[PDB]
């Protein structure tokens, strides 16, 4: 209560709520369901569990390592 | 927290002496749990009879461009787009 | 002789009668499309793209190999020419795989650009749905190449390059018709010091750089002109830099030096700038360990060791050092009262004053016009491979006959070995041997001497003997004396005034010693006294840096701007395409800062003032890309057998420290030894 | 027919050809070369000293009533001896047409202002003052119009870099918006999109 | 007027880039993997490459 | 060599020198109205010293068209300072009050960074 926002709607009901499709996901047999599809998450900004970026490539110049 | 010391699928992790782990005291590190390598070697290879086979991603127009793989060489032949493996007995 | 008139695109032009349609077209400016015509290879008619319509002819002619006659009107922009080009390359593109996003040649592929210009807009190939296009298996040609034979268009450039320039005939054309595959019949490795150029010569990119595997894209690449320093040819290259990282080394066309050709060691050593680098200044603390310190503390430690030396100071120049660091090192040693400097590769005594004793006096572009050459203990296939390409071109075209002195070597062409004794080196200079009569009867003779015989003392007299024979072989605008060096710093150091003896600094017995990019391993700690202080200035950690009491990190040849002088004497300057990593800086800046910390500063604070100081040294080092003709070169022969250091490919791969640091050369050596051990297991 | 290829207008080509020869006959001193480009547009390349009368002629002749001056465009070509070129685009409502009058200007050579003829140029040449840096003599008000008040240099000159030379931030020990040397967080990745094979054989002559 | 005209104070360039940068006039190198010479057909001015670095946040140049 | 060009507001060097001295006089009169109005932390004498330094770094030019272009640009800055037409952030840009100075000796430049 008093914490509702627009990010609580999952991916299957998002097109039904935004009038993209007239088919609810109860009878929408075309929507896939794979093993790697994660559950829906809200916007976690302003929270200790937010996103913060980083470099994905590792170090490309290696030093000596005298020993 | 184990997400700071977790390694991504590109082989990247910050060291314990690095100053760049100070950015993760207030926001958690995002590491994708679904590595593409494990989910592409979980798919078994497809046994085929013809000398050449065609791959299109398994979706038609929604997959990759259609390419032809030769199967006369023994072993597993990997499609360079989707990673599906073909084999001829 | 006379010039015949041909009307190309309704434009009259006077051409030599031996020229073809495409040469006259390139003379007036129009570029006729091609896939198999390379001007350094033999002509062929297999790609059929260059079809042009000449007047009063029933069929179009191939412009690459049809010689012109008087009165022809060639129409490049005709309707029949464009129809023929569109049909021919539609046939080229009916069986090409849809591999453009996973193809490393894409963005600079000839087939993509020749479809956007003089190509059709849509594919007429209905049969993609059923009984579709072909696919052929990949052949493990080598560890340097990545072969996807489905993308090959059968243009026969790689086979002509192997059988014409590379020398070995491992590549071939198997099969007949639509199932023809351009590859080796068995699982073999194609090995040449020139396989990287095959990636250059493949127009579609079926043959791909395997160290440059999916790394970047050609529109993204910042291209910077540089000169490779690992070989002594001084070949002009272009370096691919994107987002402050080296990607690959590609040839840049200089007709005098390299002519679109690059060695495998010069090309596939871009990984060596990434591994075993030096990023921090290191000082050997008295507990026995080399620890990384700050720049100012390392500089004052080297200054305190210099002040504790008190007159016994010597310095050794290496193989990767440029002209400017050698000038700064010699200026620092001469300002500190030390008259001894050293170079790693040795030389004869008294040959410093005249350039012709250490110069490839015949031009590398002129060596293709030689009629008979003599090799005195050198292997130019591995020591300086573009000189071997020039000798192969002169062997193919100018009917060159070549005799060699030393052990049995493969020069990628037919040659006769006279022997291994040095006394017959006198005999060719005496006139008793028949090859002396061959050299005297030749129109443009030459004698090529390796530098490792000039490292020897008594063979130095051999040098003088060859000079006497050059007084019997002098020709107008042709100097027969030739000395083929190994590293790119020896000629520059002898131009400055270095004593090229590496044992000279050991015999001087200094208290502090300067190693400037030296990794040859000629100096150890047991030769030096116990109070020595070895200072390393170079960029790569190796056996030169393993014996150093103070390690100062430098920049590589792609990270600094520096003049290098090759064997022929052409001084060329590299360009800083990528910033140095860590706390590494330019070497002459390290020497100037050391002069500031010690107390006697060098008079130059900028690079242009250092070029002015080089002008004060010698005016020919200031001008770049211009070679002045040197003068004439100016006796107990020892009984030692003549030996060559580079006799095989595995010795050629680990010549230099940058080539030592890279894992590509280790992969090549492992693949070569694996192929040899499988051959020995099968036999 | 050819549905992909654009069909031109023959009567507009004939009318602009006759009017271009008429303009080249009327002013032999200032008109340097009259050309008719593809797309049925007439370009009258003129001398710099004829910048003010020719437009006046094109304002005031009975077969040249180019009442509107829609814009003035400057093109920076550094390879030429006279660097900038200045393109006046004029619209005629009476004869329902357009003309382009092109002149060349050095970095220091003036241009006589067309504000006595067309008042819209009262700002338009100001833009050419700000973007390129050519002085317009007899201008009622010549100032920088689009750039910063403390800006140095001219932006759309090709010698000027894309990202400029300086940046602005906020500084608390001075309590002011301050000027700093330019450092991008990520540099502008230059793409090499030059064509290696020529496509148009009609433009090499 | 003399034809040798210095326009450094007019162009708005800072003086440090005037006294420090070196300008290379060159014909651009042909791509060795491509037979086309249309991009070779011009000369061009380019400026000397200074230091690039990695930003500590995310890893750009 | 020799070249015949159209002049900008002056024929010879003496008129351009007179225009530069007119700029110096007008900027001298405009400085005390700049100081009291713009809310800047610069004393009037520091402003006049900065004006002198701005003229000193352009004393070296000799060409009259370059001098007159500098006169035109200085007149534009004067017109942007008579009417206020600006803020205090742009007036202080001449002093470069935010840039920390860099050393000129080679040892400190070697220690700090490659620039
Ligand atoms: C409070 C804010 C202060 C703002 C200061 C900035 C004002 C703008 C500064 C300028 O206008 S820079 C351009 C000045 N123009 C010139 O210097 C023209 C060339 N100067 C000369 O030739 C000089 O030799 C003089 C100025 C003639 C001095 O020569 P004397 O010796 O015969
Ligand atoms: S060879 Fe050329 S056309 Fe074929 S897939 Fe590669 S980039 Fe595309
Ligand atoms: S592999 Fe490349 S170079 Fe060799 S024939 Fe095929 S397309 Fe030509
Ligand atoms: S270029 Fe003439 S047939 Fe290939
Ligand atoms: Zn696939």
Curated annotation (Swiss-Prot), chain C:
The 4Fe-4S His(Cys)3-ligated-type domain, residue ranges: 80-119
Species of the source:
Drosophila melanogaster (Fruit fly)
Q: What does the UniProt function comment say about this protein?
A: Core subunit of the mitochondrial membrane respiratory chain NADH dehydrogenase (Complex I) that is believed to belong to the minimal assembly required for catalysis. Complex I functions in the transfer of electrons from NADH to the respiratory chain. The immediate electron acceptor for the enzyme is believed to be ubiquinone. This is the largest subunit of complex I and it is a component of the iron-sulfur (IP) fragment of the enzyme. It may form part of the active site crevice where NADH is oxidized.
Quote the catalytic activity from the record: a ubiquinone + NADH + 5 H(+)(in) = a ubiquinol + NAD(+) + 4 H(+)(out)
Cofactor(s) for this protein? [2Fe-2S] cluster; [4Fe-4S] cluster
Q: Which PANTHER family match?
A: NADH-UBIQUINONE OXIDOREDUCTASE 75 KDA SUBUNIT, MITOCHONDRIAL, RESPIRATORY NITRATE REDUCTASE
What biological-process GO terms show up in the record? cellular respiration; mitochondrial electron transport, NADH to ubiquinone; mitochondrial respiratory chain complex I assembly; reactive oxygen species metabolic process
Query: What GO cellular component entries does it have?
Result: mitochondrial inner membrane; respiratory chain complex I
Q: Where does [4Fe-4S] cluster 2 bind?
A: 152, 155, 158, 202
Residue stretches making up the 2Fe-2S ferredoxin-type domain: 2-80
Question: Where does the UniProt annotation locate this protein?
Answer: Mitochondrion inner membrane
Q: Please give the Gene3D superfamilies that the UniProt record associates with this protein.
A: 3.10.20.740, 3.30.200.210, 3.30.70.20, 3.40.50.740
Membrane recorded as keyword: yes
Which gene carries the instructions for this protein?
Answer: ND-75
Q: Which residues bind [4Fe-4S] cluster 1?
A: 96, 100, 103, 109
Positions that bind [2Fe-2S] cluster: 36, 47, 50, 64
One Pfam family assigned to this protein is NADH_dhqG_C
* Family that this chain belongs to: Belongs to the complex I 75 kDa subunit family.
Q: Main localization of the protein?
A: mitochondrion
Question: Which GO molecular function entries does the Swiss-Prot or TrEMBL record give?
Answer: 2 iron, 2 sulfur cluster binding; 4 iron, 4 sulfur cluster binding; metal ion binding; NADH dehydrogenase (ubiquinone) activity
User: What UniProt keywords are attached to this protein's entry?
Assistant: 2Fe-2S, 4Fe-4S, Electron transport, Iron, Iron-sulfur, Membrane, Metal-binding, Mitochondrion, Mitochondrion inner membrane, NAD, Oxidoreductase, Respiratory chain, Transit peptide, Translocase, Transport, Ubiquinone
Q: What is this protein called?
A: NADH-ubiquinone oxidoreductase 75 kDa subunit, mitochondrial
Curated annotation (Swiss-Prot), chain D:
Per UniProt, what is the name of the gene that codes for the protein in this document?
Answer: ND-30
Protein's cellular compartments: Mitochondrion
Entry keyword NAD: yes
Domain of life of the source: Eukaryota
Enzyme class, spelled out: translocase
Which biological process, per GO, is one annotated for this protein? Answer: reactive oxygen species metabolic process
**EC number per UniProt:** 7.1.1.2
Keyword check for Transit peptide: yes
For this chain, the annotated S-S bridges are none
One GO MF term, please? NADH dehydrogenase (ubiquinone) activity
| Alphabetized UniProt keyword annotations | Electron transport, Mitochondrion, NAD, Oxidoreductase, Respiratory chain, Transit peptide, Translocase, Transport, Ubiquinone
Purpose: Core subunit of the mitochondrial membrane respiratory chain NADH dehydrogenase (Complex I) that is believed to belong to the minimal assembly required for catalysis. Complex I functions in the transfer of electrons from NADH to the respiratory chain. The immediate electron acceptor for the enzyme is believed to be ubiquinone.
What family classification does the UniProt entry report for this protein? Belongs to the complex I 30 kDa subunit family.
Name of the featured protein: NADH dehydrogenase [ubiquinone] iron-sulfur protein 3, mitochondrial
| Catalytic activities | a ubiquinone + NADH + 5 H(+)(in) = a ubiquinol + NAD(+) + 4 H(+)(out)
Any one cellular-component term (Gene Ontology):
respiratory chain complex I
Please give the subunit comment from the record. Answer: Part of the mitochondrial membrane respiratory chain NADH dehydrogenase (Complex I). Interacts with sicily; interaction is stronger with unprocessed sicily protein.
Transmembrane residues, as ranges? none
The misc remark on file is: Upon mitochondrial dysfunction, the translation of the mRNA occurring on the mitochondrial surface is impaired and amino acids non-coded by the RNA template are added to the C-terminal of the protein. The C-terminal extended proteins aggregates in the cytosol and are toxic. The phenomenon is called mitochondrial-stress induced translational termination impairment and protein carboxyl terminal extension (MISTERMINATE).
Swiss-Prot record, chain E:
The UniProt entry's sequence similarity note says: Belongs to the complex I NDUFS4 subunit family.
What is the superkingdom listed in this entry's lineage?
Eukaryota
Knockout-associated phenotype: RNAi-mediated knockdown results in mitochondrial membrane respiratory chain NADH dehydrogenase (Complex I) deficiency. Mitochondria in the flight muscle shows a wide range of structural abnormalities including dispersed cristae, onion-like swirling membranes, swollen mitochondria, sparse matrix and irregular cristae densities. Eclosion rate is reduced, locomotion and feeding are severely impaired and lifespan shortened. In the brain, there is a pericerebral fat body deficit.
Residue ranges annotated as coiled coil are none
Write down what this protein is called: NADH dehydrogenase [ubiquinone] iron-sulfur protein 4, mitochondrial
Compartments annotated for it: namely: Mitochondrion inner membrane
Function comment: Accessory subunit of the mitochondrial membrane respiratory chain NADH dehydrogenase (Complex I), that is believed not to be involved in catalysis. Complex I functions in the transfer of electrons from NADH to the respiratory chain. The immediate electron acceptor for the enzyme is believed to be ubiquinone.
């Amino acid at each position: 209560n008093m914490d509702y926002d627009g990010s609580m709607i999952p991916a299957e009901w998002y097109g039904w709520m935004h009038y993209k499709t007239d088919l609810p996901p109860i009878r929408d047999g075309c929507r896939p369901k794979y093993k790697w599809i994660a559950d829906h998450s809200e916007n976690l900004s302003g929270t200790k569990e937010a996103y913060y970026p980083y470099s994905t490539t590792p170090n490309k110049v290696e030093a000596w390592e005298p020993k | 927290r184990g997400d700071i010391e977790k390694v991504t699928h590109t082989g990247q992790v910050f060291d314990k002496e690095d100053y760049r782990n100070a950015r993760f005291v207030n926001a958690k590190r995002y590491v994708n749990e679904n590595w593409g390598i494990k989910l592409i070697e979980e798919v078994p290879p497809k046994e085929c009879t013809e000398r050449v086979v065609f791959c299109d991603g398994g979706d038609g127009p929604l997959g990759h461009p259609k390419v032809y793989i030769n199967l006369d060489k023994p072993g597993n032949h990997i499609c360079g787009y989707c990673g599906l493996r073909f084999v001829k007995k | 002789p006379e010039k015949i008139e041909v009307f190309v695109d309704d434009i009259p032009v006077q051409v030599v009668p031996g020229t073809t349609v495409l040469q006259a077209a390139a003379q007036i400016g129009v570029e006729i499309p091609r896939f198999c015509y390379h001007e350094r290879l033999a002509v062929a008619g297999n790609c059929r793209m260059c079809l042009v319509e000449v007047e009063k002819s029933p069929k179009p002619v191939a412009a690459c190999a049809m010689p012109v006659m008087k009165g022809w009107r060639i129409k490049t922009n005709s309707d029949l020419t464009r129809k023929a080009r569109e049909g021919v390359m539609e046939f080229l593109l009916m069986n090409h795989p849809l591999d453009c996003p996973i193809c490393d040649q894409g963005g600079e592929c000839d087939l993509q650009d020749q479809a956007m210009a003089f190509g059709s807009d849509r594919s007429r190939f209905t049969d993609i749905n059923y009984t579709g296009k072909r696919a052929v298996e990949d052949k493990d040609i080598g560890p340097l190449v990545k072969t996807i034979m489905t993308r090959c268009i059968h243009c026969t450039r790689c086979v002509r390059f192997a059988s014409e320039i590379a020398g070995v005939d491992d590549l071939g054309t198997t099969g007949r018709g639509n199932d023809m595959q351009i590859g080796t019949y068995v699982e073999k490795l194609f090995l040449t010091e020139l396989s990287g150029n095959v990636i250059d010569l493949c127009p579609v990119g079926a043959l791909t750089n395997k160290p440059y595997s999916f790394v970047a894209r050609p529109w993204e690449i910042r291209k910077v002109s540089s000169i490779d320093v690992l070989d002594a040819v001084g070949s002009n290259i272009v370096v691919s830099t994107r987002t402050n990282e080296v990607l690959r080394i590609l040839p840049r066309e200089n007709e005098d030096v390299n002519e679109e050709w690059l060695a495998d060691k010069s090309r596939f050593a871009c990984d060596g700038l990434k591994r075993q680098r030096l990023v921090a200044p290191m000082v050997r603390m008295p507990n026995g360990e080399l620890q990384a310190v700050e720049w100012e503390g390392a500089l004052i430690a080297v200054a305190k060791a210099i002040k504790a030396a008190g007159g016994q100071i010597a310095g050794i120049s290496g193989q990767l050092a440029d002209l400017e660091a050698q000038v700064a090192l010699k200026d620092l040693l001469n300002r500190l009262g030390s008259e001894v400097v050293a170079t790693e590769q040795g030389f004869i005594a008294g040959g410093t004053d005249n350039r012709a004793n250490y110069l490839l006096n015949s031009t590398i572009a002129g060596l293709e016009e030689a009629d008979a050459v003599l090799l005195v203990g050198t292997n130019p296939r591995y020591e300086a491979p573009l000189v071997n390409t020039r000798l192969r071109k002169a062997y193919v075209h100018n009917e060159l006959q070549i005799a060699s002195i030393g052990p049995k070597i493969d020069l990628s062409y037919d040659h006769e070995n006279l022997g291994a004794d040095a006394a017959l080196v006198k005999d060719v200079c005496s006139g008793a041997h028949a090859f002396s009569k061959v050299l005297e009867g030749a129109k443009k003779p030459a004698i090529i001497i390796g530098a490792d015989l000039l490292e020897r003392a008594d063979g130095a007299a051999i040098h003088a003997t060859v000079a006497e024979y050059c007084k019997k072989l002098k020709k107008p605008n042709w100097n027969p004396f030739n000395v083929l060096q190994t590293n790119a710093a020896q000629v520059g150091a002898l131009d400055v005034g270095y004593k090229a003896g590496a044992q000279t600094a050991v015999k001087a017995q200094p208290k502090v010693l300067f190693l400037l990019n030296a990794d040859a391993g000629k100096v150890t700690r047991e030769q030096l006294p116990k109070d020595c202080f070895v200072v390393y200035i170079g960029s790569h950690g190796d056996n030169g840096a393993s014996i150093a009491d103070a390690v100062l990190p430098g920049a590589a040849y792609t990270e600094k701007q520096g003049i290098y002088v090759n064997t022929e004497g052409r001084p060329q300057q590299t360009l800083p395409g990528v910033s140095p990593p860590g706390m590494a800086r330019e070497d002459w800046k390290i020497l100037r800062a050391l002069s500031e910390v010690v107390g006697k500063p060098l008079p130059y604070d900028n690079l242009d003032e250092l070029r002015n100081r080089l002008e004060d040294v010698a005016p020919h080092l200031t001008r770049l890309g211009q070679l002045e003709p040197a003068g004439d070169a100016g006796k107990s022969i020892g009984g030692g057998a003549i030996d060559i250091k580079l006799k095989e490919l595995r010795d050629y791969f680990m010549t230099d420290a940058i080539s030592r640091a890279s894992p590509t050369m280790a992969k090549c050596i492992s693949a070569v030894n694996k192929q040899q051990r499988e051959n020995e297991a099968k036999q | 027919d050819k549905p992909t290829v654009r069909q031109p207008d023959a009567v507009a080509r004939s009318h602009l050809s006759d009017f271009g020869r008429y303009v080249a006959e009327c002013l032999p001193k200032y008109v340097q070369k009259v050309q008719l480009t593809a797309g049925d547009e007439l370009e009258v390349l003129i001398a710099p000293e004829g910048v003010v009368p020719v437009l006046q002629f094109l304002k005031d002749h009975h077969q040249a009533q180019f009442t509107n001056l829609v814009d003035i465009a400057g093109v920076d070509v550094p390879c030429r001896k006279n660097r900038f070129e200045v393109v006046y685009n004029l619209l005629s409502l009476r004869y329902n047409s357009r003309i382009r009058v092109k002149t060349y200007t050095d970095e220091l050579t003036p241009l006589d202002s067309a504000c006595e003829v067309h008042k819209a140029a009262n700002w338009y040449e100001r833009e050419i003052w700000d973007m390129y840096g050519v002085f317009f003599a007899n201008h009622p008000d010549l100032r920088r119009i689009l750039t910063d008040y403390g800006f140095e240099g001219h932006p759309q000159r090709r010698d000027f870099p894309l990202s400029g030379y300086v940046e602005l931030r906020y500084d608390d020990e001075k309590k002011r918006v301050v000027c700093e040397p330019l450092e991008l967080a990520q540099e502008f990745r230059k793409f090499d999109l030059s064509a290696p094979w020529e496509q148009f054989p009609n433009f090499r002559n | 007027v003399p034809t040798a005209v210095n326009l450094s104070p007019i162009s708005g360039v800072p003086e440090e880039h005037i006294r420090e940068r070196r300008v290379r006039i060159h014909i651009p190198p042909k791509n060795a993997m491509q037979s086309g010479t249309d991009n070779v057909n011009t000369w061009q001015i380019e400026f000397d490459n200074r230091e690039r670095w990695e930003n500590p946040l995310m890893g750009w140049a | 060599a020799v070249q015949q060009v159209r002049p900008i507001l002056s024929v010879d060097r003496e008129e351009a020198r007179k225009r530069a001295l007119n700029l110096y006089k007008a900027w001298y009169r405009q400085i005390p109205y700049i100081v009291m109005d713009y809310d800047i932390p610069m004393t009037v004498e520091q402003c006049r010293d900065k004006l002198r330094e701005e003229f000193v770094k352009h004393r070296n030019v000799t060409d009259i068209r370059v001098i007159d272009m500098l006169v035109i640009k200085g007149q534009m800055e004067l017109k942007e300072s008579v009417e206020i037409w600006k803020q205090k952030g742009h007036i202080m840009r001449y002093w470069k009050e935010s840039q920390d100075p860099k050393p000129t000796d080679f040892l400190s430049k070697f220690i700090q960074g490659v620039n």
